Write an enzyme that holds these catalytic residues in place. Structure first.
Site, PDB file in Angstrom:
ATOM      1  N   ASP A  25      -1.843 -10.414   0.126  1.00 60.33           N
ATOM      2  CA  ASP A  25      -0.820  -9.131   0.052  1.00 60.33           C
ATOM      3  C   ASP A  25      -1.076  -8.359   1.346  1.00 60.33           C
ATOM      4  O   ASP A  25      -1.033  -7.788   1.621  1.00 60.33           O
ATOM      5  CB  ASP A  25      -0.955  -8.041  -1.136  1.00 60.33           C
ATOM      6  CG  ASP A  25       0.349  -8.149  -1.219  1.00 60.33           C
ATOM      7  OD1 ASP A  25       1.192  -8.887  -1.695  1.00 60.33           O
ATOM      8  OD2 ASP A  25       0.270  -6.530  -2.031  1.00 60.33           O
ATOM      9  N   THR A  26       0.841  -9.032   2.383  1.00 62.76           N
ATOM     10  CA  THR A  26       1.531  -7.747   3.076  1.00 62.76           C
ATOM     11  C   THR A  26       1.818  -6.234   2.610  1.00 62.76           C
ATOM     12  O   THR A  26       1.295  -5.742   3.682  1.00 62.76           O
ATOM     13  CB  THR A  26       1.616  -8.933   3.912  1.00 62.76           C
ATOM     14  OG1 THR A  26       2.874  -9.499   3.249  1.00 62.76           O
ATOM     15  CG2 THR A  26       1.739 -10.550   4.832  1.00 62.76           C
ATOM     16  N   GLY A  27       1.939  -6.603   1.074  1.00 64.32           N
ATOM     17  CA  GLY A  27       2.673  -5.785   1.079  1.00 64.32           C
ATOM     18  C   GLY A  27       1.869  -4.546   0.442  1.00 64.32           C
ATOM     19  O   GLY A  27       1.509  -3.243  -0.171  1.00 64.32           O
TER      20      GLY A  27
HETATM   21  C1  LIG Z   1      -2.573  -2.345  -4.370  1.00 64.98           C
HETATM   22  C2  LIG Z   1      -1.731  -1.518  -3.719  1.00 64.98           C
HETATM   23  C3  LIG Z   1      -2.883  -1.045  -1.910  1.00 64.98           C
HETATM   24  C4  LIG Z   1      -1.452  -0.157  -4.132  1.00 64.98           C
HETATM   25  O1  LIG Z   1      -0.626  -1.984  -3.158  1.00 64.98           O
HETATM   26  C5  LIG Z   1       0.442  -2.502  -3.837  1.00 64.98           C
HETATM   27  O2  LIG Z   1       0.560  -1.691  -5.124  1.00 64.98           O
HETATM   28  N1  LIG Z   1       1.464  -2.686  -2.917  1.00 64.98           N
HETATM   29  C6  LIG Z   1       3.133  -2.978  -3.972  1.00 64.98           C
HETATM   30  C7  LIG Z   1       3.994  -2.511  -2.927  1.00 64.98           C
HETATM   31  C8  LIG Z   1       3.508  -0.523  -3.000  1.00 64.98           C
HETATM   32  C9  LIG Z   1       2.554  -0.239  -1.926  1.00 64.98           C
HETATM   33  C10 LIG Z   1       2.534   1.162  -2.012  1.00 64.98           C
HETATM   34  C11 LIG Z   1       3.331   1.930  -2.930  1.00 64.98           C
HETATM   35  C12 LIG Z   1       3.966   1.138  -3.916  1.00 64.98           C
HETATM   36  C13 LIG Z   1       4.187  -0.036  -3.544  1.00 64.98           C
HETATM   37  C14 LIG Z   1       3.362  -4.344  -3.642  1.00 64.98           C
HETATM   38  O3  LIG Z   1       3.210  -5.027  -2.244  1.00 64.98           O
HETATM   39  C15 LIG Z   1       2.455  -5.682  -4.123  1.00 64.98           C
HETATM   40  N2  LIG Z   1       1.639  -6.739  -4.011  1.00 64.98           N
HETATM   41  C16 LIG Z   1       1.879  -7.609  -5.512  1.00 64.98           C
HETATM   42  C17 LIG Z   1       0.290  -7.092  -5.788  1.00 64.98           C
HETATM   43  C18 LIG Z   1       0.038  -8.433  -6.725  1.00 64.98           C
HETATM   44  C19 LIG Z   1       0.417  -9.823  -7.341  1.00 64.98           C
HETATM   45  C20 LIG Z   1       0.509 -10.454  -7.729  1.00 64.98           C
HETATM   46  C21 LIG Z   1      -0.343  -9.607  -9.235  1.00 64.98           C
HETATM   47  C22 LIG Z   1      -0.690  -8.674  -8.957  1.00 64.98           C
HETATM   48  C23 LIG Z   1      -0.130  -7.631  -8.271  1.00 64.98           C
HETATM   49  C24 LIG Z   1       2.711  -7.420  -6.541  1.00 64.98           C
HETATM   50  O4  LIG Z   1       3.094  -6.489  -7.096  1.00 64.98           O
HETATM   51  N3  LIG Z   1       3.491  -9.221  -6.558  1.00 64.98           N
HETATM   52  C25 LIG Z   1       4.569  -8.337  -8.209  1.00 64.98           C
HETATM   53  C26 LIG Z   1       5.435  -8.150  -7.424  1.00 64.98           C
HETATM   54  C27 LIG Z   1       6.740  -7.641  -8.935  1.00 64.98           C
HETATM   55  C28 LIG Z   1       7.468  -9.454  -9.020  1.00 64.98           C
HETATM   56  O5  LIG Z   1       8.156  -9.726  -8.168  1.00 64.98           O
HETATM   57  O6  LIG Z   1       7.321  -9.752 -10.509  1.00 64.98           O
HETATM   58  C29 LIG Z   1       4.405 -10.203  -8.447  1.00 64.98           C
HETATM   59  O7  LIG Z   1       4.740 -10.797  -7.515  1.00 64.98           O
HETATM   60  N4  LIG Z   1       4.721 -10.423 -10.335  1.00 64.98           N
HETATM   61  C30 LIG Z   1       4.724 -11.551 -11.015  1.00 64.98           C
HETATM   62  C31 LIG Z   1       3.323 -11.919 -10.895  1.00 64.98           C
HETATM   63  C32 LIG Z   1       2.249 -11.225 -11.916  1.00 64.98           C
HETATM   64  C33 LIG Z   1       1.184 -11.803 -12.901  1.00 64.98           C
HETATM   65  C34 LIG Z   1       0.754 -10.760 -13.907  1.00 64.98           C
HETATM   66  C35 LIG Z   1       1.108  -9.800 -13.727  1.00 64.98           C
HETATM   67  C36 LIG Z   1       2.102  -9.159 -14.061  1.00 64.98           C
HETATM   68  C37 LIG Z   1       3.407 -10.225 -12.977  1.00 64.98           C
HETATM   69  C38 LIG Z   1       5.434 -11.336 -11.961  1.00 64.98           C
HETATM   70  N5  LIG Z   1       5.489 -12.543 -12.947  1.00 64.98           N
HETATM   71  O8  LIG Z   1       5.634  -9.819 -12.520  1.00 64.98           O
END
Ligand SMILES: CC(C)(C)OC(=O)N[C@@H](Cc1ccccc1)[C@@H](O)CN[C@@H](Cc1ccccc1)C(=O)N[C@@H](CCC(=O)O)C(=O)N[C@@H](Cc1ccccc1)C(N)=O
Lengths: 99, 99
Positions: A25-27
């Site tokens: 994760d780059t975010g």
């Molecule tokens: C962990 C931490 C250090 C606190 O950083 C962030 O949360 N950063 C987030 C941005 C941010 C930073 C600071 C303050 C506020 C906001 C973002 O980059 C995180 N990237 C991914 C992390 C992640 C990926 C996959 C699973 C869990 C977590 C993300 O949110 N991804 C979401 C973004 C929203 C979206 O596009 O839907 C995603 O792809 N979700 C998918 C996959 C998924 C799997 C399982 C459950 C829920 C969602 C989805 N289907 O909704």
């Protein structure tokens, strides 16, 4: 290696002498890993992402090996749906965003 | 361009004829932008990230311009703390993870 983004950029990491798999994760500012058994004394923290803030346990000076590369950094352990390799470590294995 | 990760990889995007700034998230499956005025009919959705799921409004066939490059894709609009450019679009401007 060059990783394209047609599939979630999952990478195998060896941390705590255990084999895991983490999202690149780059975010993510921090590297937050799921719940697991980790050595040393820690500290309670709170991070936020889309959806809300979670209380995680913080660990410093922690060796981890992402795709063979070693890097000693701070790892957050908490209720994260997926292991996340953030910039605190991504910078250490010298990762870049090229488009 | 080659973007390092010592600073959050923020990139300026022009969408809806407005100037924004978005985070380049490789951990994001979808491109979710903050609340704004967007043309066309939409549909209600729910996405999850670290912290929980959020109800967002979905839009398809939407032109956007990340660092000059154009790409027509699906954009989610909801209460996200920061604009996020996910893989649905990152693949279109041909972005890679090189380490
Ligand atoms: C962990 C931490 C250090 C606190 O950083 C962030 O949360 N950063 C987030 C941005 C941010 C930073 C600071 C303050 C506020 C906001 C973002 O980059 C995180 N990237 C991914 C992390 C992640 C990926 C996959 C699973 C869990 C977590 C993300 O949110 N991804 C979401 C973004 C929203 C979206 O596009 O839907 C995603 O792809 N979700 C998918 C996959 C998924 C799997 C399982 C459950 C829920 C969602 C989805 N289907 O909704």
């Amino acid at each position: 290696p060059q990783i394209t983004l047609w599939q979630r950029p999952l990478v195998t990491i060896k941390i705590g002498g255990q084999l895991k798999e983490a999202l690149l994760d780059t975010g993510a500012d921090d590297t937050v890993l799921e719940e697991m058994s980790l050595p040393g004394r820690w500290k309670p923290k709170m991070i936020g992402g889309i959806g809300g803030f979670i209380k995680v346990r913080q660990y410093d000076q922690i060796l981890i090996e992402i795709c063979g590369h070693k890097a000693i950094g701070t790892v957050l352990v908490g209720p994260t749906p997926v292991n996340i390799i953030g910039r605190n470590l991504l910078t250490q294995i010298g990762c870049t965003l090229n488009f």
